[PDB]
Every structure is written in C-alpha cells, then in structure tokens.
Design brief:
The protein is mostly loops and 77 residues long. Helices cover 14% and strands 0% of the residues. Interacts with host homodimeric histone-like protein (HU) hupA; thereby replacing dsDNA from the HU-DNA complex.
Length: 77
C-alpha cells in the first residue's frame, strides 16, 4: 500500500515543506479525511492510531514530518 519508500524523503520534507506548502509531499492521495493519515505510514505505532487510526498522535513523528500536514493541509496527489 505505497509508503515505506518515500518515507525517507521525509528527511528533506521536514526541512523545506515545514513551510506548510499545499504541495505537501506525504505520499499520494488522501487516506484520511484531511489526508493526514499518511504520516503514520512509517512508525505505525498503535498509540498514534488514537488520532485517525492511521497517522501520528504527534508524540514521535516530528522527525518524520508530522506537523507539516497536521490537518492543516488537504492536498492529495
């Protein structure tokens, strides 16, 4: 189900895309209501499932670009 490959691209995503661009480079298409599901693809911890049953709970995903989307962006691909 995609993911796992582009997850290392998160390195530079948190670098540049932290600006809040609607060219948000978090995988393709919306999985969550506001696409914000796509962040839990890498660390997939169950405690994060509390947020949308898919994404970060915003406790640990920061180094993996969580606050870039965090329900602020709604841009699919």
């Amino acid at each position: 189900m995609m993911t796992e490959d582009q997850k290392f691209k998160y390195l530079t995503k948190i670098e540049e895309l932290e600006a809040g661009c609607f060219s948000d480079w978090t995988k393709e298409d919306i999985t969550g209501d506001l696409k914000y599901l796509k962040k839990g693809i890498i660390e997939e911890s169950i405690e994060l499932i509390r947020a949308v049953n898919g994404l970060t709970y915003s406790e640990e995903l920061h180094d993996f670009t969580q606050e870039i989307i965090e329900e602020l962006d709604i841009s699919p691909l």
